[PDB]
Enzyme design. Structure first.
Site, PDB file in Angstrom:
ATOM      1  N   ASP A   1       0.869  -1.229   0.043  1.00  0.00           N
ATOM      2  CA  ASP A   1       0.080   0.211   0.270  1.00  0.00           C
ATOM      3  C   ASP A   1       0.933   1.221   0.015  1.00  0.00           C
ATOM      4  OD1 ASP A   1      -2.319   2.018   0.609  1.00  0.00           O
ATOM      5  OD2 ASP A   1      -1.975   1.840   2.439  1.00  0.00           O
TER       6      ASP A   1
ATOM      7  N   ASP B   1      -1.916   5.615  -5.064  1.00  0.00           N
ATOM      8  CA  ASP B   1      -2.331   4.606  -3.847  1.00  0.00           C
ATOM      9  C   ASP B   1      -2.507   3.210  -4.309  1.00  0.00           C
ATOM     10  OD1 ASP B   1      -2.889   3.576  -1.482  1.00  0.00           O
ATOM     11  OD2 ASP B   1      -5.070   4.474  -1.652  1.00  0.00           O
TER      12      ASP B   1
HETATM   13  C1  MMI Z   1      -7.157  -2.933   3.153  1.00  0.00           C
HETATM   14  C2  MMI Z   1      -7.679  -1.550   2.892  1.00  0.00           C
HETATM   15  C3  MMI Z   1      -8.578  -1.341   4.076  1.00  0.00           C
HETATM   16  C4  MMI Z   1      -6.785  -0.551   2.682  1.00  0.00           C
HETATM   17  C5  MMI Z   1      -7.147   0.915   2.424  1.00  0.00           C
HETATM   18  N1  MMI Z   1      -8.155   1.078   1.336  1.00  0.00           N
HETATM   19  C6  MMI Z   1      -9.390   1.942   1.203  1.00  0.00           C
HETATM   20  O1  MMI Z   1      -9.688   2.416   2.171  1.00  0.00           O
HETATM   21  C7  MMI Z   1     -10.218   1.685  -0.014  1.00  0.00           C
HETATM   22  C8  MMI Z   1     -10.370   3.165  -0.582  1.00  0.00           C
HETATM   23  C9  MMI Z   1     -11.031   3.228  -2.009  1.00  0.00           C
HETATM   24  O2  MMI Z   1     -11.405   4.169  -2.205  1.00  0.00           O
HETATM   25  N2  MMI Z   1     -10.820   2.043  -2.851  1.00  0.00           N
HETATM   26  C10 MMI Z   1     -11.341   2.287  -4.208  1.00  0.00           C
HETATM   27  C11 MMI Z   1     -12.061   1.051  -4.483  1.00  0.00           C
HETATM   28  C12 MMI Z   1     -13.557   1.050  -4.058  1.00  0.00           C
HETATM   29  C13 MMI Z   1     -14.309  -0.382  -4.142  1.00  0.00           C
HETATM   30  C14 MMI Z   1     -15.851  -0.170  -3.574  1.00  0.00           C
HETATM   31  C15 MMI Z   1     -15.855  -0.771  -2.171  1.00  0.00           C
HETATM   32  O3  MMI Z   1     -14.940  -0.101  -1.330  1.00  0.00           O
HETATM   33  C16 MMI Z   1     -15.092  -0.185  -0.053  1.00  0.00           C
HETATM   34  O4  MMI Z   1     -16.172   0.219   0.536  1.00  0.00           O
HETATM   35  N3  MMI Z   1     -13.957  -0.562   0.777  1.00  0.00           N
HETATM   36  C17 MMI Z   1     -12.517  -0.960   0.786  1.00  0.00           C
HETATM   37  C18 MMI Z   1     -12.488  -2.372   0.084  1.00  0.00           C
HETATM   38  C19 MMI Z   1     -10.904  -2.988  -0.175  1.00  0.00           C
HETATM   39  C20 MMI Z   1     -13.179  -3.291   1.014  1.00  0.00           C
HETATM   40  C21 MMI Z   1     -12.016  -0.007  -0.303  1.00  0.00           C
HETATM   41  O5  MMI Z   1     -11.772  -0.046  -1.633  1.00  0.00           O
HETATM   42  N4  MMI Z   1     -11.603   1.143   0.398  1.00  0.00           N
HETATM   43  C22 MMI Z   1      -6.034   1.991   2.225  1.00  0.00           C
HETATM   44  O6  MMI Z   1      -5.901   2.253   0.660  1.00  0.00           O
HETATM   45  C23 MMI Z   1      -6.168   3.332   2.976  1.00  0.00           C
HETATM   46  C24 MMI Z   1      -6.081   4.697   2.596  1.00  0.00           C
HETATM   47  C25 MMI Z   1      -6.731   5.226   1.401  1.00  0.00           C
HETATM   48  C26 MMI Z   1      -6.234   5.713   3.995  1.00  0.00           C
HETATM   49  O7  MMI Z   1      -7.138   5.888   4.180  1.00  0.00           O
HETATM   50  N5  MMI Z   1      -5.002   5.861   4.325  1.00  0.00           N
HETATM   51  C27 MMI Z   1      -5.030   6.962   5.795  1.00  0.00           C
HETATM   52  C28 MMI Z   1      -5.639   8.066   5.476  1.00  0.00           C
HETATM   53  O8  MMI Z   1      -5.117   8.832   4.393  1.00  0.00           O
HETATM   54  N6  MMI Z   1      -6.327   9.018   6.441  1.00  0.00           N
HETATM   55  C29 MMI Z   1      -7.037  10.202   6.514  1.00  0.00           C
HETATM   56  C30 MMI Z   1      -8.107  10.354   7.234  1.00  0.00           C
HETATM   57  C31 MMI Z   1      -8.244  11.220   8.551  1.00  0.00           C
HETATM   58  C32 MMI Z   1      -9.242  11.186   9.397  1.00  0.00           C
HETATM   59  C33 MMI Z   1     -10.333  10.571   8.887  1.00  0.00           C
HETATM   60  C34 MMI Z   1     -10.589   9.741   7.662  1.00  0.00           C
HETATM   61  C35 MMI Z   1      -9.583   9.740   6.874  1.00  0.00           C
HETATM   62  C36 MMI Z   1      -3.389   6.988   6.347  1.00  0.00           C
HETATM   63  C37 MMI Z   1      -3.187   7.867   7.546  1.00  0.00           C
HETATM   64  C38 MMI Z   1      -2.807   5.671   6.580  1.00  0.00           C
END
Ligand code: MMI
Length: 389
Positions: free
Chosen positions: A36, A232
């Site tokens: 990731d 990403d």
């Molecule tokens: C195994 C999985 C859970 C890994 C994470 N992936 C995800 O969260 C991805 C993001 C995305 O848009 N994917 C597109 C396909 C959508 C398909 C339809 C279904 O999608 C979903 O509902 N869920 C998931 C799937 C894999 C089950 C998914 O795809 N989510 C990872 O990439 C995390 C990234 C995106 C992330 O959020 N990183 C943090 C961040 O940026 N945080 C910011 C933040 C701060 C405060 C509140 C909220 C966010 C960081 C600190 C480590």
């Protein structure tokens, strides 16, 4: 030139993700770590769980170190809670080195471990800035670059099968290749164009123009970068800001009007089916993303086919049709050039010269009439404006 050693060391699909193999602790505890590039924590399962075939067992690692510090971590869709520590890590099919890196032992988690994915951990390839708890928890790749000689750069080659694979095939298949500390020419064709990395936190880039079948979506570029645009590998779809996404869908829809599909489809929820090998790849438009270049007032572009944005899934009732899901969805957190888009190129994450590489992947799906691409240069101006502040 080429690191045959690390080639094909990846596994999986855009669905559950592409993971690589690593050994945590003493003695070695093999574990498949999800690659990731959108996070910076190295967190492996450290407890029994419904979806984990094997996990991290500190009690059995002679070199495990406790940091009496916990960690909460939310994800766009998910979140895990664990206990911070350190241990000796190694990459079987990677540079021959053993480094001590912070390992966040996941002890509790909700909607994170994917069922069937086959990876028990996640390797956050990003920068400290986004690490949890604070930016002081040295990401793994840093520990690696600090403790060894390994050039401060890694490249990625994710390969989508183009068709649905069964958990047996996944295992016995070559998801992709993550070249640690180098660039293997055998993974791509064409030249390799580079776009600058804005801020060294997420792997942030800037988009300056967007086309559908060559038709400029014609929007204030800032909108494309609304909030931010990142590369990403951990995200599947191509996430686009509402205002944009909506414009995109209106275009993709219009270009494929000869065939109409349910709203469900366009909203990335339900699949679309076609008789075996009769998918109308041609009625769907190609998407061209213009990325900023390194030479002032100069930009280049990457173009993907519907074989990138139409994600292959198994038949409604596992039969003989060929079905997919529209893999472009809106984002409240900017643009996410996820796994799909990546599947179309060989990306060089050259942290050293603070720039991201883009080449045509020697393994992207295509037909005999259209091929993905990375073409340049283009004389465009005031791209620093496209940036969001
Ligand atoms: C195994 C999985 C859970 C890994 C994470 N992936 C995800 O969260 C991805 C993001 C995305 O848009 N994917 C597109 C396909 C959508 C398909 C339809 C279904 O999608 C979903 O509902 N869920 C998931 C799937 C894999 C089950 C998914 O795809 N989510 C990872 O990439 C995390 C990234 C995106 C992330 O959020 N990183 C943090 C961040 O940026 N945080 C910011 C933040 C701060 C405060 C509140 C909220 C966010 C960081 C600190 C480590």
């Amino acid at each position: 030139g080429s690191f045959v050693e690390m080639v094909d060391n990846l596994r999986g699909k855009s669905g559950q993700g592409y993971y690589v193999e690593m050994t945590v602790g003493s003695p070695p505890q093999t574990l498949n770590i999800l690659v990731d590039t959108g996070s910076s924590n190295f967190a492996v399962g450290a407890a029994p769980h419904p979806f984990l075939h094997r996990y991290y067992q500190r009690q059995l690692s002679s070199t495990y170190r406790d940091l009496r510090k916990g960690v909460y971590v939310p994800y766009t869709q998910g979140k895990w809670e664990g206990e911070l520590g350190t241990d000796l890590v190694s990459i079987p099919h990677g540079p021959n080195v053993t480094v001590r890196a912070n390992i966040a032992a996941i002890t509790e988690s909700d909607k994170f471990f994917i069922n069937g994915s086959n990876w028990e951990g996640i390797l956050g390839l990003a920068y400290a800035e986004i690490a949890r708890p604070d930016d002081s928890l040295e990401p793994f790749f840093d520990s690696l670059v600090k403790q060894t000689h390994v050039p401060n750069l890694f490249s990625l080659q994710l390969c989508g099968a183009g068709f649905p694979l069964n958990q047996s095939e996944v295992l016995a298949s070559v998801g992709g290749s993550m070249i640690i500390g180098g660039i293997d020419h055998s993974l791509y064709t064409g030249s390799l164009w580079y776009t600058p990395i804005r801020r060294e936190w997420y792997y942030e880039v800037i988009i300056v123009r967007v086309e559908i079948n060559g038709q400029d979506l014609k929007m204030d570029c800032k909108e494309y970068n609304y909030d931010k645009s990142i590369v990403d590998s951990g995200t599947t779809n191509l996430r686009l800001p509402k205002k944009v996404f909506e414009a995109a869908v209106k275009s993709i829809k219009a270009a494929s009007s000869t065939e109409k599909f349910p709203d469900g489809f366009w909203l990335g929820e339900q699949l679309v089916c076609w008789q075996a090998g009769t998918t109308p790849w041609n009625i769907f438009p190609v998407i061209s993303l213009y990325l900023m270049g390194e030479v002032t007032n100069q930009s280049f572009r990457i173009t993907i086919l519907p074989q990138q944005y139409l994600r292959p899934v198994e038949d409604v009732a596992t039969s003989q049709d060929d079905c997919y899901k529209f893999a472009i969805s809106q984002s409240s957190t900017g643009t996410v050039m996820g796994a799909v888009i990546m599947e179309g190129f060989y990306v060089v994450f050259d942290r050293a010269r603070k720039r991201i590489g883009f080449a045509v992947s020697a393994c992207h799906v295509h037909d005999e009439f259209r091929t993905a691409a990375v073409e340049g240069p283009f004389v465009t101006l005031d791209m620093e404006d496209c940036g969001y502040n």
